[PDB]
Design a protein around this ligand. Structure first.
Ligand SMILES: *[C@@H]1O[C@H](CO)[C@@H](O[C@@H]2O[C@H](CO)[C@@H](O)[C@H](O)[C@H]2NC(C)=O)[C@H](O)[C@H]1NC(C)=O
Ligand SMILES: *[C@@H]1O[C@H](CO)[C@@H](O[C@@H]2O[C@H](CO)[C@@H](O)[C@H](O)[C@H]2NC(C)=O)[C@H](O)[C@H]1NC(C)=O
Ligand SMILES: *[C@@H]1O[C@H](CO)[C@@H](O[C@@H]2O[C@H](CO)[C@@H](O)[C@H](O)[C@H]2NC(C)=O)[C@H](O)[C@H]1NC(C)=O
Ligand SMILES: *[C@@H]1O[C@H](CO)[C@@H](O[C@@H]2O[C@H](CO)[C@@H](O)[C@H](O)[C@H]2NC(C)=O)[C@H](O)[C@H]1NC(C)=O
Ligand SMILES: *[C@@H]1O[C@H](CO)[C@@H](O[C@@H]2O[C@H](CO)[C@@H](O)[C@H](O)[C@H]2NC(C)=O)[C@H](O)[C@H]1NC(C)=O
Ligand SMILES: *[C@@H]1O[C@H](CO)[C@@H](O[C@@H]2O[C@H](CO)[C@@H](O)[C@H](O)[C@H]2NC(C)=O)[C@H](O)[C@H]1NC(C)=O
Ligand SMILES: *[C@@H]1O[C@H](CO)[C@@H](O[C@@H]2O[C@H](CO)[C@@H](O)[C@H](O)[C@H]2NC(C)=O)[C@H](O)[C@H]1NC(C)=O
Ligand SMILES: *[C@@H]1O[C@H](CO)[C@@H](O[C@@H]2O[C@H](CO)[C@@H](O)[C@H](O)[C@H]2NC(C)=O)[C@H](O)[C@H]1NC(C)=O
Ligand SMILES: *[C@@H]1O[C@H](CO)[C@@H](O)[C@H](O)[C@H]1NC(C)=O
Lengths: 50, 197, 269, 205
């Protein structure tokens, strides 16, 4: 929904209130989204490097 | 003479300085966003009105590089000064005298030291004393005689199984216990470990 | 700086070899940390153990000796200390020595100093009963050893009570470990502000490379990318310099700690 | 194999425990036999035979000599602001003029560093007030200092060990200034200190 980025998407157990769309933790980095077509909380994790 | 790579610290200092100087030299061959890394060409190719812009790019890039190099040099200088202060203290305390602080110069009981010079530093040869060839003995903290406690003036009481001697604390040298190397204090009813002799 | 943008990578390619130096500095810092820990703790050659029967003339080291029941093999005071104090291209490497190895070094040092005295710091450890080692240590401050043997129980009780009080003072009162705490806080603050700095506009049109790339043509997209690049490079250099300063300070503290270990633990000062 | 540090390919884990050879991390490291990896062994293991009425007293001794190496100085360097960042161009100099006095500060800093280096060497070595000499006949109770005392044969005034040490280790606006004290002077200080400590003890300090 216009919020772009890369990473791996997993299932998450967070609980947004009925009007948020996504989340962030500290330094304002997105780490959870709600898919519009299902209204369930996903989870974003950057894919590995080293 | 045989083993190499034993002088790592001085070699590392030399290599660090050489690397810093080398990268500073090589940084001259970059563009920093201009059209060329050589000033004469951009001077001789295009109209000055924008040559000032390109030269400004070069100027700011090279100032950045120079400033970074200077700061690194300052940090390294502080570290070397700390090391030099330590070296001066070691020379003062272990070469011009005998030290009591443990392991400050040499592992063991310090005897003396000798300095030698190296291309950018100093090499101390610490000569120390190390005991060896231990042995077992039985000990007691005081001796009862005539109802009086006796303690050793200097040394420690030992026994080889049948007789009791007093020795110094770092070299086995037994001697007969005598009223001249021991002193008396009170009756022996309160000391935990007294033996009769 | 780039975050997987080929255009950004090519643009940054012409800024010289800043990044090799930037990585080399951090690598040197990490190796220095490992060396710091090594030279502070690895003072012993063997691993000494304490005998099962513990009769040290009435003294009581239970609160300090390791407890085998716990899985960390730590001690009571160490447990109190450990309980009391508490990705965008960033990596954290693990220390070479684990906490169990450090606790084992500490246990070896403490068992050696209980059982042998100062002798294990010079050559091979030599055993001596604890009471007549404290007699030697009284002899080293101008009091005749006499005084120790006639007040042994009183001295042992004073020592035990002091240990109890130090236990209670740590266990109840907080804010006693400000140094490690604010070291951690300073490092966290530095990383936090470095990460937050990525949201700065720096005088460009936006703070995201994808928008600039997909909003307008390359010719001035290059200018905007250049603005972002110079801002982020400035931030990174500032971070690295502050890290180097703090590393120098920590190294000074580590050298002081090593000297204190060598002089006040392996001998009498 | 798999580790806390990461994943390791081309090595075989073993249950043994030797001294650490190539530190891999998180408490493990590797060596060659093929290539093997293992967990560090902090050292040997002994239990000293404690008892409340037993001591151990040495009966013999040994004397050991060990080395310790410290750096005290680095090369003194200086850099020409203008000829570096401009390379003999009038326009570059004119443009640089309006930046204020930046590189005056840089030259000041580098000068301070060089002076500091000279001070470092002066403090370390100039510990003596005179220049002591060793007597020609050398009977130090059977001790033998020949490898350490300088020999007049070679035209270096350096000793054997000093020669081994000196053999073991080996412009665009930048200049290197020479150190104030030449190497022969430093060797003279070391010889003075060493003759003083051989003949007088600690009294001369
Ligand atoms: C959006 O559309 C989807 C699909 O068109 C809807 O999905 C429904 O999902 C439930 C649960 O799996 C099914 O029982 C329905 O049959 C689905 N409907 C259809 C039309 O397929 C979804 O409900 C719609 N609304 C939201 C808010 O997602
Ligand atoms: C402990 O030391 C004493 C002192 O030397 C030993 O006693 C001597 O033993 C020799 C050898 O038999 C005799 O010639 C001497 O006459 C003994 N001394 C006296 C005063 O009688 C003793 O043998 C040693 N015991 C052990 C177990 O080592
Ligand atoms: C060492 O101390 C004395 C030395 O004569 C002895 O102990 C005495 O033993 C007798 C016999 O039982 C008692 O009547 C005395 O009261 C004891 N002396 C004291 C001071 O109590 C014996 O040779 C040794 N005793 C011990 C305990 O080692
Ligand atoms: C050393 O001190 C500890 C106290 O920390 C003693 O442990 C106590 O022992 C008594 C009796 O055995 C118990 O009632 C307490 O509950 C114990 N306290 C703890 C915290 O465990 C220990 O006994 C002392 N050492 C010796 C040899 O007595
Ligand atoms: C001093 O005596 C003790 C007790 O006999 C020795 O300790 C034991 O020595 C035997 C060798 O005869 C070993 O097999 C045991 O493992 C030792 N026990 C412990 C707990 O270490 C000790 O070696 C003797 N000291 C010496 C010989 O210097
Ligand atoms: C050293 O050992 C203990 C204290 O560590 C004490 O000795 C005890 O003495 C009683 C009776 O006198 C015996 O029943 C014990 O078996 C002894 N214990 C041990 C470990 O030997 C005493 O303080 C010291 N002296 C002796 C001879 O043991
Ligand atoms: C102390 O150690 C020294 C060094 O090993 C011993 O000297 C050795 O003695 C044997 C027998 O006399 C000789 O074969 C060796 O050549 C000696 N070594 C050296 C380096 O000269 C000395 O004997 C030991 N002390 C005692 C009392 O035995
Ligand atoms: C001090 O040690 C040196 C060893 O470097 C001795 O010099 C050796 O002496 C022997 C016997 O005269 C010669 O065969 C060697 O060629 C000498 N070595 C060198 C490098 O010249 C020196 O003799 C010893 N001091 C004394 C007084 O004997
Ligand atoms: C090594 O240790 C593991 C873990 O205890 C054990 O399963 C194995 O049998 C041991 N021996 C070998 C040869 O792996």
């Amino acid at each position: 929904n216009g919020l772009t980025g890369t990473g791996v998407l997993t299932e998450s157990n967070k609980k947004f209130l009925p009007f948020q769309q996504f989340g962030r933790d500290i330094a304002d980095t997105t780490d959870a989204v709600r898919d519009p077509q299902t209204l369930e909380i996903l989870d974003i994790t950057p894919c590995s490097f080293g | 003479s045989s083993t190499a790579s034993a002088l790592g610290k001085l070699q590392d200092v030399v290599n660090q300085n050489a690397q810093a100087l080398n990268t500073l030299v090589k940084q001259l061959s970059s563009n920093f966003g201009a059209i060329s890394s050589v000033l004469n060409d951009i001077l001789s190719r295009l109209d000055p009105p924008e040559a000032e812009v390109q030269i400004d790019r070069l100027i700011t890039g090279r100032l950045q590089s120079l400033q970074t190099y200077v700061t690194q040099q300052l940090i390294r200088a502080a570290e070397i000064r700390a090391s030099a202060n330590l070296a001066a203290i070691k020379m003062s305390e272990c070469v011009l005298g005998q030290s009591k602080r443990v392991d400050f110069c040499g592992k063991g009981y310090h005897l003396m030291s000798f300095p030698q010079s190296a291309p950018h530093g100093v090499v101390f040869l610490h000569v120390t004393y190390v005991p060896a060839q231990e042995k077992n003995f039985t000990t007691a903290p005081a001796i009862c005689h005539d109802g009086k406690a006796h303690f050793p003036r200097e040394g420690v009481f030992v026994s080889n199984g049948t007789h009791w001697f007093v020795t110094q604390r770092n070299f086995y040298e037994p001697q007969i216990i005598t009223t001249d190397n021991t002193f008396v204090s009170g009756n022996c009813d309160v000391v935990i470990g007294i033996v009769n002799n | 700086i780039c975050g997987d943008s080929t255009e950004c990578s090519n643009l940054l390619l012409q800024y010289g070899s800043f990044c090799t130096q930037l990585n080399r500095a951090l690598t040197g810092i990490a190796v220095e940390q490992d060396k710091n820990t090594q030279e502070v703790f690895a003072q012993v050659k063997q691993i000494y153990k304490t005998p099962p029967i513990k009769d040290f003339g009435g003294f009581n080291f239970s609160q300090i000796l390791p407890d085998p029941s716990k899985p960390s093999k730590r001690s009571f005071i160490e447990d109190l200390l450990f309980n009391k104090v508490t990705f965008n291209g960033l990596t954290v490497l693990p220390p070479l020595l684990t906490d169990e190895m450090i606790a084992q070094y500490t246990s070896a040092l403490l068992a050696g100093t209980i059982t042998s005295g100062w002798t294990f710091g010079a050559g091979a450890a030599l055993q001596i009963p604890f009471a007549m080692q404290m007699a030697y240590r009284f002899n080293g401050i101008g009091v005749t050893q006499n005084v120790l043997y006639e007040n042994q129980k009183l001295i042992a009780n004073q020592f035990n009570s002091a240990i109890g009080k130090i236990q209670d003072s740590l266990s109840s009162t907080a804010s006693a470990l400000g140094k490690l705490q604010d070291v951690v806080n300073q490092n966290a603050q530095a990383l936090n502000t470095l990460v937050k700095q990525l949201s700065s506009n720096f005088g460009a049109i936006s703070s995201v490379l994808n928008d600039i790339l997909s909003r307008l043509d390359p010719p001035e997209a290059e200018v905007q990318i250049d603005r972002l690049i110079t801002g982020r490079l400035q931030s990174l250099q500032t971070y690295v310099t502050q890290q180097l300063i703090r590393a120098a300070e920590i190294r000074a503290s580590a050298n002081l700690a090593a000297i204190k270990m060598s002089e006040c633990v392996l001998g009498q000062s | 194999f798999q580790t806390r540090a990461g994943c390791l390919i081309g090595a075989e884990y073993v249950n043994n425990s030797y001294e650490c050879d190539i530190p891999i991390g998180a408490g493990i490291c590797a060596s060659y036999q093929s290539i093997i990896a293992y967990t560090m062994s902090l050292g040997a293991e002994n239990s000293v035979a404690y008892s409340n009425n037993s001591i151990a007293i040495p009966t013999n001794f040994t004397i050991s000599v060990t080395t310790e190496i410290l750096p005290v100085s680095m090369t003194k360097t200086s850099v020409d602001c203008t000829m570096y960042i401009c390379g003999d161009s009038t326009e570059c100099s004119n443009l640089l003029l309006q930046y204020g006095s930046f590189c005056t500060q840089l030259n000041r800093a580098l000068t301070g560093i060089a002076v500091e280096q000279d001070k470092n060497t002066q403090e370390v070595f100039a510990q003596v007030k005179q220049i002591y000499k060793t007597p020609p006949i050398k009977d130090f109770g059977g001790f033998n200092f020949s490898q350490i005392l300088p020999d007049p044969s070679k035209p270096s005034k350096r000793s054997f060990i000093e020669d081994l040490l000196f053999n073991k280790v080996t412009f665009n606006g930048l200049t290197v200034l020479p150190p104030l004290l030449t190497d022969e002077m430093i060797a003279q200080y070391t010889s003075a200190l060493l003759a003083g400590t051989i003949t007088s003890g600690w009294t001369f300090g």
